[PDB]
Amino acid sequence: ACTKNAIAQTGFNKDKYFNGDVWYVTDYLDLEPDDVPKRYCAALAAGTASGKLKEALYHYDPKTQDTFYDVSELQVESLGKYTANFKKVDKNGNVKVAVTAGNYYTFTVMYADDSSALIHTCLHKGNKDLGDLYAVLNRNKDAAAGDKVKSAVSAATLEFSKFISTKENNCAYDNDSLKSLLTK
Ligand code: HEM
Ligand SMILES: [S]
Numbered sequence: 001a002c003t004k005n006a007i008a009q010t011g012f013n014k015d016k017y018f019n020g021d022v023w024y025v026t027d028y029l030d031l032e033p034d035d036v037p038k039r040y041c042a043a044l045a046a047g048t049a050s051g052k053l054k055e056a057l058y059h060y061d062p063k064t065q066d067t068f069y070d071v072s073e074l075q076v077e078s079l080g081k082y083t084a085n086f087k088k089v090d091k092n093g094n095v096k097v098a099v100t101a102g103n104y105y106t107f108t109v110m111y112a113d114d115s116s117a118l119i120h121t122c123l124h125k126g127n128k129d130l131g132d133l134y135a136v137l138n139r140n141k142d143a144a145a146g147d148k149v150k151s152a153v154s155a156a157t158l159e160f161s162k163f164i165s166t167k168e169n170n171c172a173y174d175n176d177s178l179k180s181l182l183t184k
Helices: 147-155 175-181
Strands: 022-030 041-049 052-060 067-078 081-089 095-097 104-112 116-124 132-138
Touching: 022 175, 041 175, 052 081, 052 175, 067 104, 067 175, 104 147, 116 147, 132 147
Parallel strands: none
Antiparallel strands: 022 041, 022 132, 041 052, 052 067, 067 081, 081 095, 081 104, 104 116, 116 132
């Protein structure tokens, strides 16, 4: 189960964050890691379509090859804090698993600037028991975390050395599909 009420960035700029571009996960901190963690690569596009906040997600496990996409509409809880019902889709946006109650994640932007962000997510999926996940994002694939986001990690009272890097994972990303999915 999740345990954190993440605080959103003061002065969070939603239009800048939800601009249609892609964010790559470069480092992450799972507060409830599985006994045997599946080391996934992940990226998302965040945008606005017809005035609705949307995110498209991409997960890729570079060992098993497991790959999946999702699209979500985000509902506002407060500035920088959202609740997202996800639907699993193929890369083209065709629905594989429909939206359903209890399949959602919360999403809090704790820090963001033009190139980087720190987010918290809490995933709820059926009868699974999942915990908090923090992620450092960058606009550039596998970019080393800069001082601004690392300082935000500290300011959240988290230790960056505890984060797991995805940068050495042989990750590949379908960023064109993520961008196009925002309308789906
Ligand atoms: C490197 C960072 C991440 C890792 C290692 C990771 C890992 C995983 C894993 C292992 C699952 C499968 C859960 C299961 O069904 O047992 C999953 C599902 C999911 N994750 Fe992540 N994740 C990451 C980042 C993110 C982010 C940043 C978000 C939200 C923005 C997110 C949202 C989701 C959603 C919505 C699902 C369920 C999708 C579906 O079933 O259709 N993940 N993730
Ligand atoms: S996740």
